[PDB]
Every structure is written in C-alpha cells, then in structure tokens.
UniProtKB/Swiss-Prot annotation:
Keywords: Antibiotic resistance, Hydrolase, Metal-binding, Periplasm, Signal, Zinc
GO molecular function: beta-lactamase activity; zinc ion binding
Function as written in the Swiss-Prot or TrEMBL entry: Confers resistance to the different beta-lactams antibiotics (penicillin, cephalosporin and carbapenem) via the hydrolysis of the beta-lactam ring. Active on cephalosporin and penicillin.
Regulation (activators, inhibitors): Inhibited by captopril stereoisomers and iodoacetate. Also inhibited by chelating agents such as EDTA.
GO cellular component: periplasmic space
Subunit structure: Monomer.
Sites where the protein binds substrate: K162, N171
Protein name: Metallo-beta-lactamase type 2
Cofactor dependence: Zn(2+)
Catalytic activity: a beta-lactam + H2O = a substituted beta-amino acid
Primary location class: periplasm
Entry keyword Zinc: yes
Amino acid sequence: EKTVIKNTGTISISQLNKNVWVHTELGSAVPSNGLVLNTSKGLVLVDSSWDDKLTKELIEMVEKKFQKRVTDVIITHAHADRIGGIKTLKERGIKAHSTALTAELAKKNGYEEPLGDLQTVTNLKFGNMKVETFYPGKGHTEDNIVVWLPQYNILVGGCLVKSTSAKDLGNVADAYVNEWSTSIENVLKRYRNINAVVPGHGEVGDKGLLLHTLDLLK
Ligand SMILES: O=C(O)/C(S)=C/c1c(Cl)ccc(Cl)c1Cl
Ligand SMILES: [Zn+2]
Ligand SMILES: [Zn+2]
C-alpha cells in the first residue's frame, strides 16, 4: 500500500515512488491533483492549487517533510485549480513555468503571470530529476500541457485526462471537443509505454485513462 500523508484533511500527498508524490487538495467540493518531485536541488511541483491559502499550506507541508525548498512549479493550464496560487509562488521567489499561451490566458483572466518559458516540447532537469513538458494540442482547454517523467514513465495528464470516476467531460466552456481526441492521440503516440497516469482530478490510473477520455469524447 502506498504511503499517504494528510495535513484538516484538505491536503494529502501520496507516494508513487522514492522521489515522486501526488498532491491532492479539496477546493470549491472538488478534489484536484498535482505532483511533488523530491530532487537533490529542491522540491518541484507540477501545478499549484485552487487558491493561495491551499498553495501556501501545500508548500509548507512538503518543505517541512522533505526538508528542502520548493524552487519551481510547472503550471499546466490557466484555470484556478492549476494556477490559483500563482501570487504565492511569485512573492516567495518560486519559479512558475508555463507555455506562453498559458501565461497570456492567465493575464487575460486577471492572474499574475507565469514565465511563459515552455515550448511545445521542453526538457528540464532538477538535480537528477528529468522532466519533459509537452503541448499535445487543444482539449480540456486550448493551452493544456502534459508532463512526462522519463525516468519513471509517469505521465501527468492534468485536466486533459479524465479519471475513471468521471462519467462526462465536465465543464467544456473553455474546451475544444473536436480537437481533444487528436490531442490525446498525440500523447499516446509520443509516450507508447506508460506506467502511471495522473489525471487532473480523481484516482491515479494508467493508459486506460487516456482511452476512457477518448470514449467520453464520443
Ligand atoms: O474540469 C476541470 O478539470 C476544470 S479545471 C474545470 C474548471 C473550469 Cl472548466 C473552469 C474553472 C475552474 Cl476553477 C475549473 Cl475547476
Ligand atoms: Zn481546467
Ligand atoms: Zn482541472
């Protein structure tokens, strides 16, 4: 059984392996997932949380547990569950990575701006931790990216990828339902061997979540 650690219970982290954890927060009631990467040069998060209060608590929880600082965050699209803590990141000197499009949309919607440094494919390295970011096309939003850990074949699907418990596509106001399938296929083509898939919301699964999402798009 995987190690799970809670704060009230509104914040929980679950261990996938030695240096990779999933962080899950309760907002709005809607759970949301990101990733915590424990590296030799600091903690790196995939995505922040619903607001600054949760993001502050999240950072402080992991900094205390792993006894190092959060240095970087990768923001995977410009909705609040992803970017709501951007103010906290900026003021603490935490680098908030994103595509230029994610940054533009963030600004348009009144959030503070992440860096806009991520290209269609960007390869980062934090200590020994390798991280690839990939823009597969439009889906849940026009800007959604996925994150790949090549040393573990772990894919962070974000809100592009629906969990098994999701029986519909959810809010599609900002979505592109005619391109979303092609974008999933682009992910499946790039990462042909996947061990775990972390959805934006819900339980961790595998490649099956990508197939589940394709079915929901029919
Ligand atoms: O279904 C999802 O994954 C997301 S992020 C839903 C959503 C939207 Cl579409 C707008 C705004 C907000 Cl706050 C949320 Cl949570
Ligand atoms: Zn979203
Ligand atoms: Zn979401």
